[PDB]
């Protein structure tokens, strides 16, 4: 554990955000195959 001030609350938002882009990639590749 630690302080996790504006570091975890901020950088944590980017992680979740980029995650969406990865999930979108998965659904998009299906367009190439299927």
From Swiss-Prot:
Processing and modification events after translation: Phosphorylated by protein kinase C.
Summary of the tissues where the protein is detected: Ubiquitous. Highest expression in the brain and muscle. Expressed in oligodendrocytes. Isoform IIA is expressed only in the brain, where it is detected in the gray matter, but not in the white matter. Isoform BIN1 is widely expressed with highest expression in skeletal muscle.
Transmembrane annotation, as ranges: none
Coiled coil: 15-33
Sites bearing N-acetylalanine, chain numbering: 2
Clinical note on disease: Myopathy, centronuclear, 2: A congenital muscle disorder characterized by progressive muscular weakness and wasting involving mainly limb girdle, trunk, and neck muscles. It may also affect distal muscles. Weakness may be present during childhood or adolescence or may not become evident until the third decade of life. Ptosis is a frequent clinical feature. BIN1 mutations have been found in families segregating autosomal dominant centronuclear myopathy. Patients show adult-onset, mildly progressive muscle weakness affecting selected proximal muscles and all distal muscles of the lower limbs.
Quaternary structure and partners: Heterodimer with AMPH. Binds SH3GLB1. Interacts (via SH3 domain) with DNM1. Interacts with SYNJ1. Interacts (via SH3 domain) with DNM2. Isoform IIA interacts with CLTC. Isoform IIB does not interact with CLTC. Isoform IIC1 does not interact with CLTC. Isoform IIC2 does not interact with CLTC. Interacts with AP2A2. Interacts with AP2B1. Interacts with MYC (via N-terminal transactivation domain); the interaction requires the integrity of the conserved MYC box regions 1 and 2. Interacts with BIN2. Interacts with SNX4. Interacts (via BAR domain) with BACE1. Binds (via BAR domain) F-actin. (Microbial infection) Interacts (SH3 domain) with HCV NS5A.
Purpose: Is a key player in the control of plasma membrane curvature, membrane shaping and membrane remodeling. Required in muscle cells for the formation of T-tubules, tubular invaginations of the plasma membrane that function in depolarization-contraction coupling. Is a negative regulator of endocytosis. Is also involved in the regulation of intracellular vesicles sorting, modulation of BACE1 trafficking and the control of amyloid-beta production. In neuronal circuits, endocytosis regulation may influence the internalization of PHF-tau aggregates.
Name of the protein: Myc box-dependent-interacting protein 1
Primary gene name: BIN1
Residues of the full protein shown: 1 to 33 of 593
